[PDB]
Structure formats: structure tokens, C-alpha cells
Ligand binder design. Structure first.
Ligand code: RFL
Length: 394
């Protein structure tokens, strides 16, 4: 096979980049290890930044989101028997976020790509990268038995945290920055109306809790749990009972519960590699960095990496300015770190950490009181939540 840009991974990152590149006349082939249905089984993200929303419209894949998505102008934080609303629209200068499931986004992109006739190879096993330092790199893989080769000009590693792309770069050329948190998020998707029209992040003595949604009739709740917990030990009943216990009584009382459509435990981690490229290989999304879900930045950083890489690839193909691709990592890393810092802060002030001394506890409580009780404080939260502006490039 032969293409211009080879893309590893049919997740949100690969699909969005592929779609974007396709519409601009740049040939691209996506290689996915799993099956279409397997990819669609992942719930994940719910909050999208305006930047991601715009990138979707630019990909021509926004019909459904426009119709089914919900724009939120604020979020609530509950702590120490208080409930503080963060007016995102007002504090950020008019910016908002949109609630639209990652599953739907992925689905919208997949159907759109199939309709356009772009190349996507699912169940592509043993993906291996080759000749990344040359001008003619290629990818090898196995499909239903035989080994195939895909020649290209550039490879976009969009294969997630455990993708092969980041492992295809000489370790000594990369610097890893990482932190694993002493707890995970037990999530529960239920076909019930959300308890609130806006998200509710709750710091409670018993632990973190979050009330989110996917639509007017679909909810997504999370509760903090230690690493030792196994999802099989948490029945829907146990979840609802614990969730209720971590929420203000006036909220737990009217909460509509129901059987889970999906339950699982996701560990929290911050991760960043520098640089994010190597020769003809560029890493995007989870392949290059991870953030705890607390700040709703994971998918949105994948979006900004993709926007940056796409625009640089345009410059390269349309304008023969391939040397600009050298600025990919630098550009992306600046937005990444600021998003990592916010995600870390959110995680830091909303979760209960084991072995917390009296001082740390008081500081965490005061962080909320100050940031939630100051116009300037609220502003640092809002502007970061809606997401910082994309860097123009060039
Ligand atoms: C609880 C949760 C909430 C989240 N909430 C939000 C949120 O509201 N807002 C937000 O911005 N982000 C959130 N996240 C994070 C977000 O979901 C992630 O950052 C996002 O999924 C990243 O997207 P991508 O970079 O595209 O990465 P993905 O992991 O989604 O997709 C990568 C694809 O690569 C494939 N693959 C892997 N190895 C391969 C190989 N060697 N060869 C070929 N294919 C391979 C995989 O099968 C897969 O299909 C969340 C993630 C969570 N979980 C479970 C991880």
C-alpha cells in the first residue's frame, strides 16, 4: 500500500486528523488494532472545549453534535457543606464547553470517514514502524494472516497510551514526566435524567464524587475509589448508595437512579513525553500525554495536538514548507503543560488523599474557599476549564 500520511489508531485523534486531512486533499490511511465495535465500547469523555467543537465542524462532522450536544455555561463545585457555581461564560469572557459523549464523536467520525471512502484498516495486527529518519518511512502489519507494508511520507502516532508509536522512538531520545495518583474513578453510565442541568464536582470527606451527563436522559456519575478496588465488588446499589452519601442531601434526595449501562474503574495519572516527534513520526493525544479526568482535558488536548499537526502538514504539502513540522513538539507542549497543571490542580483540590496531615487538609479546604470566593480566583478556574486558546503557529 501507499499513502501520504499513515495514521496509527482509529480513536478520536486518528479519526479527526484523518478526516481533516482527507477534506484537504491529503491522502491518509488509518491502521486500527481493534474492531470498530471494540472502539465504540469505550465511554470516556463527556466535556468538549470550544476548540474541539470547532475542529469537528471543520472536519464536516458536526451535524449530530449540533443537534444532540448540550452547551454548558457553568459548573458547580461542592465542598465543606457549600455549593459554589463557576459561571464559565461570564468569567471566561463568553467561552463555554459542550457536553457530547466521546463515543458519539468517535461514531460520528467513523461513519463520516466510511461515507467519504477514506481508507481504514481495522484488526491491523503487529503494527511496526520503520525508517523514521529517512524521507521514505513505512509501516508493516498483519491482516487476516499475511504481512502487508504501507509506504508514506509521515506517520502520526495516534495509538493511545499503550500504542506502539511512542515505543518506536529510541527511549534515550525522550524524557518522561509522570505521576500516578493513589486512587481511581469508578464510573457509572445510567439511562436516567441527570440530577442537575450542570456538572457537580464534589469534594467530600468520604471522597470525590462527580455528577455529569451525556444528554437529558443519560447520566454519567463517578466516585473516587482506592487502587485496591475491583469493579466486580461494586453493585449498582452500592454505587448509588455511596454516591448519594458524597453529595449534598438536597441533591441526593432527588437523584434518579437506575441500572448501569456501563461501570468501570479508571486509574488517575499525569504523563508527558518530550519531545513528541522523531524523524517522520509525530505523536498525538494519549500516545504523547495523559491527564487525570478531573479537568476534562484528555480528549481536548488530543484535539489541539491534531489541529496543530494538521495545519503543519498542510503547510508541508500545500506550501512545500516541511521544515515547519520541526516546531510541532514545542507548540503542542506549551498547551499540554498548562493543561497538565490545571488537571493536576483540579485533581489536587477535589480528591481525598490517603495520609493527609492536618495542615494539608486545611490548605486544600482554603484553596477552594479562596479560588471559589474571589473574582480573580474564579477566573483562573473558568478560563482554564473552557480551555486556553490554540497557538496560531507560523
Ligand atoms: C473516566 C474517563 C473520563 C474522561 N473524561 C474526559 C472529558 O470529559 N474530557 C476530555 O477532554 N477528556 C476526557 N478523558 C480522556 C480521553 O477520553 C482521552 O484523552 C482520549 O481517549 C484520547 O484519544 P486518542 O489519543 O485518540 O486515544 P485513544 O486511546 O482513545 O485511541 C487510540 C487508538 O489506538 C489503538 N491502538 C493501540 N495500540 C495500537 C497499535 N499498536 N496498533 C494500532 N492501533 C493501536 C487503540 O485500539 C485505539 O482505538 C476521559 C477518560 C476516561 N477514561 C476511562 C480513560
Amino acid at each position: 500500500m501507499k499513502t501520504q500520511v499513515a495514521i496509527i489508531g482509529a480513536g478520536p485523534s486518528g479519526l479527526l486528523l484523518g478526516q481533516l486531512l482527507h477534506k484537504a486533499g491529503i491522502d491518509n490511511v488509518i491502521l486500527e488494532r481493534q474492531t470498530p465495535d471494540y472502539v465504540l465500547g469505550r465511554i470516556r469523555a463527556g466535556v468538549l472545549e470550544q476548540g474541539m467543537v470547532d475542529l469537528l465542524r471543520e472536519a464536516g462532522v458536526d451535524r449530530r453534535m449540533a443537534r444532540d450536544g448540550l452547551v454548558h455555561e457553568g459548573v458547580e463545585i461542592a465542598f465543606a457543606g457549600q455549593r459554589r457555581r463557576i459561571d464559565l461564560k461570564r468569567l471566561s469572557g463568553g467561552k463555554t464547553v459542550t457536553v457530547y459523549g466521546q463515543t458519539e464523536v468517535t461514531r460520528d467520525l467513523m461513519e463520516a470517514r466510511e461515507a467519504c471512502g477514506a481508507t481504514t484498516v481495522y484488526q491491523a495486527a503487529e503494527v511496526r514502524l520503520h525508517d523514521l529518519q529517512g524521507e521514505r518511512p513505512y509501516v508493516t502489519f498483519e491482516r487476516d494472516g499475511e504481512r502487508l507494508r504501507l509506504d508514506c511520507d509521515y506517520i502520526a502516532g495516534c495509538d493511545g497510551f499503550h500504542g506502539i508509536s511512542r515505543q518506536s522512538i529510541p527511549a534515550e531520545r525522550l524524557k518522561v514526566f509522570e505521576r500516578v495518583y493513589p486512587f481511581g474513578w469508578l464510573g457509572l453510565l445510567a439511562d436516567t435524567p441527570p440530577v442537575s442541568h450542570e456538572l457537580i464536582y464534589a469534594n467530600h470527606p468520604r471522597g470525590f464524587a462527580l455528577c455529569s451527563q451525556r444528554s437529558a436522559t443519560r447520566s454519567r456519575y463517578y466516585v473516587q475509589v482506592p487502587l485496591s478496588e475491583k469493579v466486580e465488588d461494586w453493585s449498582d446499589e452500592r454505587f448509588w448508595t455511596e454516591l448519594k452519601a458524597r453529595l449534598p442531601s438536597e441533591v441526593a434526595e432527588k437523584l434518579v437512579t437506575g441500572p448501569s449501562l456501563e461501570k468501570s474503574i479508571a486509574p488517575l495519572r499525569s504523563f508527558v513525553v518530550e519531545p513528541m516527534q522523531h524523524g517522520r513520526l509525530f505523536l498525538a493525544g494519549d500516545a504523547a500525554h495523559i491527564v487525570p479526568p478531573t479537568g476534562a482535558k484528555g480528549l481536548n488536548l488530543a484535539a489541539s495536538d491534531v489541529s496543530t499537526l494538521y495545519r503543519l502538514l498542510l503547510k508541508a504539502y500545500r506550501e512545500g514548507r516541511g521544515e515547519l513540522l520541526e516546531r510541532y513538539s514545542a507548540i503542542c507542549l506549551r498547551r499540554i503543560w498548562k493543561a497538565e497543571r490545571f488537571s493536576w490542580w483540579m485533581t489536587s483540590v477535589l480528591h481525598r488523599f490517603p495520609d493527609t496531615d492536618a495542615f494539608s487538609q486545611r490548605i486544600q479546604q482554603t484553596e477552594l474557599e479562596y479560588y471559589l470566593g474571589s473574582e480573580a480566583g474564579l477566573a483562573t478556574i473558568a478560563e482554564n476549564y473552557v480551555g486556553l486558546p490554540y497557538e496560531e503557529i507560523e
